[PDB]
């Protein structure tokens, strides 16, 4: 009852009822995204490995929430060559919830 699907290159696999975080989605906080190029759907031994995709089915999912994340520092350094560099970084991610599976 779980689906593998592509999203920005970085793939995902999840069943129904749990959230999945992804990149900065350009779909607002209440709409719904269909994943038209889904990869795999499995349901307990009635499965098919599509070439390349499963034909009819698509996983639709409502978009739940945005978010900024984790400040992870960046230190660059060369010993005694008189050079160091400081940088900062947070990631803008967005979690959705799977609402509709369709084989």
């Amino acid at each position: 009852m779980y689906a593998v699907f592509q999203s920005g290159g970085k793939q995902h696999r999840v069943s129904e009822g749990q959230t999945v975080r992804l990149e900065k989605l350009d779909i607002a906080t209440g709409e719904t995204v269909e994943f038209a190029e889904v990869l795999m759907i499995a349901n307990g031994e009635e499965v098919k490995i599509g070439v390349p995709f499963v034909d009819g089915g698509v996983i639709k999912a409502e978009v739940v929430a945005h978010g900024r994340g984790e400040k992870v520092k960046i230190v660059k350094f060369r010993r005694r060559k008189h050079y160091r560099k400081q940088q900062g970084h947070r990631q803008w991610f967005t979690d959705v919830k799977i609402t509709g599976i369709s084989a």
Binding site: Q11, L39, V47, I49, V51, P52
Partner: peptide, 23 residues
């Protein structure tokens, strides 16, 4: 078979679902 499924999820199928990886 022209699949594009990566090593992460190709391993993760073989973690639990043994009959689908058998398929």
């Amino acid at each position: 078979a022209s699949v594009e499924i990566d090593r992460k999820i190709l391993a993760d199928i073989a973690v639990f679902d043994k009959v689908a990886f058998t398929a």
